[PDB]
Amino acid sequence: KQFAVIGLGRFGGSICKELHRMGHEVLAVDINEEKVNAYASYATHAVIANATEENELLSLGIRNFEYVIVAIGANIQASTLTTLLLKELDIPNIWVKAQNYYHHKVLEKIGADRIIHPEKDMGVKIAQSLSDENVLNYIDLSDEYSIVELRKLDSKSIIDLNVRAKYGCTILAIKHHGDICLSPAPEDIIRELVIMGHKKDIKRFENE
Amino acid sequence: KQFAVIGLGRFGGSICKELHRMGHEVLAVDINEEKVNAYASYATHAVIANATEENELLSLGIRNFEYVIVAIGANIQASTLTTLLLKELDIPNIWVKAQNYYHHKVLEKIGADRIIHPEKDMGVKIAQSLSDENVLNYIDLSDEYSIVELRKLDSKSIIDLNVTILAIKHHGDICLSLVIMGHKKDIKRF
Amino acid sequence: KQFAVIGLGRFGGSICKELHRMGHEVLAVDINEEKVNAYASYATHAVIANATEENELLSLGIRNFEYVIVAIGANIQASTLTTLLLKELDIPNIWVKAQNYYHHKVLEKIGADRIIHPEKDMGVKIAQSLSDE
Amino acid sequence: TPPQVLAIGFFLTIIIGAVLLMLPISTTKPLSWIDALFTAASATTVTGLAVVDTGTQFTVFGQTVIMGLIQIGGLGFMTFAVLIVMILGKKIGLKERMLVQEALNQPTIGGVIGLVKVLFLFSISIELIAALILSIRLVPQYGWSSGLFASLFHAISAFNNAGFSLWPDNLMSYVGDPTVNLVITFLFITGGIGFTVLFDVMKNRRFKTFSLHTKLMLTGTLMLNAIAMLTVFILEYSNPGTLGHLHIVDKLWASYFQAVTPRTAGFNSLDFGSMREGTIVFTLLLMFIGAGSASTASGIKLTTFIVILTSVIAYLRGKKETVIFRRSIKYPIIIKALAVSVTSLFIVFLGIFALTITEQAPFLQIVFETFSAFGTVGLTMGLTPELTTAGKCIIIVIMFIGRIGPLTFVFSFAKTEQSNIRYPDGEVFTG
Amino acid sequence: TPPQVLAIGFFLTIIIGAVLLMLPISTTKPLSWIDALFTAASATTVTGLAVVDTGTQFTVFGQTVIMGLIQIGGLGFMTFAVLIVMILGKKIGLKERMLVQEALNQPTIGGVIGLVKVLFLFSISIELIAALILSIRLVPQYGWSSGLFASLFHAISAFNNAGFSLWPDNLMSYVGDPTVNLVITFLFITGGIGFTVLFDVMKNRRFKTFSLHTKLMLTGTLMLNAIAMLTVFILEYSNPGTLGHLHIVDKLWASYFQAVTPRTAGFNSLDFGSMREGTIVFTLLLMFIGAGSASTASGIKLTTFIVILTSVIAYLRGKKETVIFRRSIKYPIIIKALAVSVTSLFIVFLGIFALTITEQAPFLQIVFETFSAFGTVGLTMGLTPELTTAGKCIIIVIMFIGRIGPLTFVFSFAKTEQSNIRYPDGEVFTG
Ligand SMILES: Nc1ncnc2c1ncn2[C@@H]1O[C@H](COP(=O)(O)OP(=O)(O)OP(=O)(O)O)[C@@H](O)[C@H]1O
Ligand SMILES: Nc1ncnc2c1ncn2[C@@H]1O[C@H](COP(=O)(O)OP(=O)(O)OP(=O)(O)O)[C@@H](O)[C@H]1O
Ligand SMILES: Nc1ncnc2c1ncn2[C@@H]1O[C@H](COP(=O)(O)OP(=O)(O)OP(=O)(O)O)[C@@H](O)[C@H]1O
Ligand SMILES: [K+]
Ligand SMILES: [K+]
Ligand code: NA
Ligand code: NA
């Protein structure tokens, strides 16, 4: 697996550092010299290049990468022309960071395999946490079912609450001072919690 | 025939590539390094120079070219001073890309052999196509006669209509003796 | 004698070319690289320097010149600090190009030996020609 | 002045060492003023050129003074000055820290005192271990008093890239011995690779984490030694004087030893006087190039040679930048490497020119001697014992400038004044 | 390809000249394939190294072929190609004009065809006048048929910096003659100063109006000749072999002649084989440096030597820019001069290395021969007649690369691809 990350910003630079940490060959490309110097130690290869130029793109041997990540999300012209070149160069997987809804529509027309909205996805997740302070983190399995990680419940056993059949949600795990429990069979003492269930049913539990 | 093209834009770069394709010696001059690098393969010689400087103009041997094309149409000062230098250097043919009407007037005073309005000429031709969707392309022979290339006419013989029809295109096949030549008013009647 | 012309503009460059044509040793100083290259052939010595810095002024041997002409006439700060340095360096003759009336007064205070108004003086001669044509 | 302190301090160590060697206690036979000055200079510059035999001319005390001069010269004058200051309780100031940066050729003063602590601790440790490894071999041959001192002397001599030997034949009796060949070669390869390189491979232990300088030295040394070993073996295979009447196993040892000793230790196992001129010509280039930049070796460093060579190759291929290991090399690095190379070549040319005037010797020996002295290598073709007093004085100057570095030597007597004025561009054809 | 046309065209002139010299008409004694190829290469590269005596081996027709090869090589292949094209009525195109710019090492194509017209007209004019001046002296000694041809041969040989001589002793019988000394020295000093320099002094006639390149060549040549003349006179004053048994008036002539002939004519009046090694060492540096950039002389040009030397001195004094004659010298000039100097030194090193392997000759003669061949000087210490066939082949390659220039030769077989990508800066210590 050889990965190319084009554009070293907050999003693109984070991908380079994480992939390099996992032990992958990463080519970091950016048009700004200061960015490339900073990430020269966090990538296998770091090049100062303009990704909108076909000659510079071919000078990098970009055809040797299965995955190319275009992490340019504030320059629509630079973002769309880069992915147009990569599609012309027959890159199998092209993942692009989109700016707005109109940028997303263009990238879908010119063939971006995956389109990413980092700030928009995080903003929705943060806004869910603001609305319900109990909700610490959640993953949306579907449009009606989700897994949500959450003093009345304190000193209460699992068998004490019968939300298993009434509310209809299964308690996946409970965190006890840095200790996790898998398949918690009642009764276990709850001390001042991961639950899977229907989205409406989960809200019922938070009420009581 | 040795041609010099000064200024490598959409218009100047198109002239360099077309002349080079036809097999001509083209000198491509531009003040921007990135432009010169791009067209270095589409010209016999490509130089990064300021055409408003006489010393740089003489360093190129510009006197050896019969035709010089000044394709700078957004910098009036750079365009007019370049052609003033070329006229002083006794270049036989100087063709200049003009920006507006006032730029055209200045270039006529300082002796430009031919003045070109690329966008203005195309805009008039496009606007003719917009007005009449039937009109695909046309050449104006005069101010009253022109050749215009164009379901009622379908399945109709030439002798069926008693309206000169220069040629008709049949699925990529052309016939000599829908292209029609006639008076401008008469063409609109058809 | 030796002349130093600081600031190669329309007025400063015209002094260098005329003095160099007459066969005089002229030092041309300008903070702009393009100006110095253009006047390299029209001066005995052409240097890219900032005249407001004393160290750069001493690097040129400015004390060797009897006449120094400050031909900066649009930058009052650069013009007045240059002639302040030259007055400190005990230059016998300092001729400065003034911008307006207030610039003229400042230069007269800080010891400019002669103050020149090229555009203002020509504008009066042209106006006289227009009135009586 | 930091360059001035380096020159003044290094020059004093030559005079102090010369006085000690000229004492009746440190010598067995009468010693001339020039020979004592030459031997001290050859030791503090860690060159190894020997007018008189070290084993016979000097006594045990004299050889101990030689070890002190070798150790002081190998690690540098400022390395010991900081340690003495540190032990006396005095803290290193900003002015003193700038001297250490200049002495170690460091671009920044960041952690330069910590580098001195590491390199000295590493130096004494590796020499002590190497002495023990040499002791087991050298004890049955010379007993205990002589055997232990011989191993200690050669371990210090090898690590510092000195080439001094107590035996009359410098290591020529250990051609086939793997222990002496492996230990001594390992000493001056690591001693000359560079202190910064060793420190980098100590903390970091994966190649991709090494700095650009460390990667250049490790790959450059391996490639340069491999090319040298092949050249010596092929050219000298059928030479009766050297490498001819030897077994294939001994041929590989001698070829390997004579490929790494020019940079810049100066030990030998074959007679360079009987080698073919083709091998000598390649050795001239070999010992003009040195080893790591901040180390016990001298000459133009291996990185200086690579930086210039890559810069030229980049120009010949139309490239606008010098790139090694996917890193661009800036103009200040290029100009410094060119200043080092041009000044070094000019000094060698003057030494060859001066020696031809002074002495009536074959030209090849004069050229070999000057390159050997300037690189502080110490290899000889037989000219050093035959040098006249004027010739010895020239070699002393060449050895001194070679060790201190031509740039630092010039910076000592050249004053730099900063001028902010520029000049219009001039055109000149340099074809 | 412009560099490729220069190499291909120059190589063909060697083969064509070799065939003509190997014909029975152009020779008196049987001539080997290698000697014919060597003589043709030595003439078209305008070097002057002579395996066989020109006066005896070749006939008048053969010597006429030598003059043609000397004239073609001295002015360059492209100089005559343009003239032939111009006479045939064909106009010079842009592609052809670019070849002339490459051949003349010109930065711009501005007025490069006019330069060719001037330099050829100047060349034939000055040689014809010089032949007439030499004719009055050389007619009473050799009659009319031989005397006129001898003067014409030497005038063409001198102006083109060839060093070919019809007499067995190359100009050794005219040591005290002022006419031969003045005319011949004036021919190769002006022939090698540079065509652009001569053109500049023709139109402009005041020193302050000269370009930077012209001022460097005029002042550099005067200073370099003055230093060389003093060195030869002082070192060779008491040498019995050369300059010893001569009058003071003849000593000054011979010292002056031997100071300017290494750059790069190759005539002699004294025997370089009997000179002291100190004078030979200085001559090595003298003929490694050449003369004007666009001229009939070779080697690294005098401006290349000055640009590098001034750039190093500027660095050693802390200055951030290289300034000569109140003009700053840009980085592209510095890097090109470095590429010229490094590639030239590497080629000379290979030639010395190759010659030592091939031939059993004293090292000084091998070094002198390689520097003489690469600079296309032609001075010998006695090695050229003793070269083996393999040794002659090496010299032919060295002479060919020296005349064409190491940069143009490398550009012939090196393809340049433009990449706009840059790399992060890397740090490396080049002390
Ligand atoms: N043509 C280009 N080729 C390569 N890199 C480019 C190009 N144009 C911009 N970049 C770089 O891509 C990076 C990301 O672009 P930019 O900062 O505009 O986006 P962003 O959406 O604000 O980024 P982020 O939110 O990840 O910080 C920047 O470091 C920028 O310099
Ligand atoms: N002084 C100059 N000398 C040479 N080239 C110049 C100069 N000034 C501008 N150019 C170049 O001329 C080209 C065309 O100029 P410009 O972009 O201003 O005109 P334009 O009318 O917008 O062009 P086009 O419509 O053909 O794209 C550009 O590539 C520009 O860099
Ligand atoms: N500090 C300085 N040192 C040297 N030269 C300077 C300095 N500041 C400005 N100059 C130069 O002085 C010249 C004249 O200055 P400027 O153009 O502001 O004046 P001006 O009144 O417009 O002149 P002019 O009418 O003569 O064209 C310019 O070439 C400018 O670059
Ligand atoms: K040594
Ligand atoms: K010659
Ligand atoms: Na963002
Ligand atoms: Na346009």
Residue numbers in the entry:
A (entry chain D): 7 to 156, 160 to 201, 205 to 220
B (entry chain F): 7 to 156, 160 to 172, 179 to 192, 205 to 217
C (entry chain H): 7 to 139
D (entry chain K), E (entry chain L): 15 to 445
Passage from the reporting paper:
The K+ uptake system KtrAB is essential for bacterial survival in low K+ environments. The activity of KtrAB is regulated by nucleotides and Na+. The KtrAB system is composed of the transmembrane KtrB dimer, each containing four structurally similar domains (D1~D4) arranged around a four-fold pseudosymmetry axis normal to the cell membrane, and the regulatory KtrA octamer (tetramer of homodimer) with a ring-like structure, known as the RCK gating ring. ATP binding to KtrA octamer activates K+ flux activity of KtrB, whereas ADP binding inactivates it.
Mg2+-added and Mg2+-free ATP-BsKtrAB cryo-EM structures (Structure I and Structure II) are virtually identical with an r.m.s.d. of 0.30 Å over 2104 Cα atoms. A clear region of unassigned cryo-EM density between the two adjacent ATPs at the intra-dimer interface was observed in Structure I. To minimize the uncertain effects that Mg2+ may cause on the structure of BsKtrAB (Structure I), we hereafter used Mg2+-free ATP-BsKtrAB (Structure II) in comparison with ADP-BsKtrAB (Structure III) for the following structural analysis.
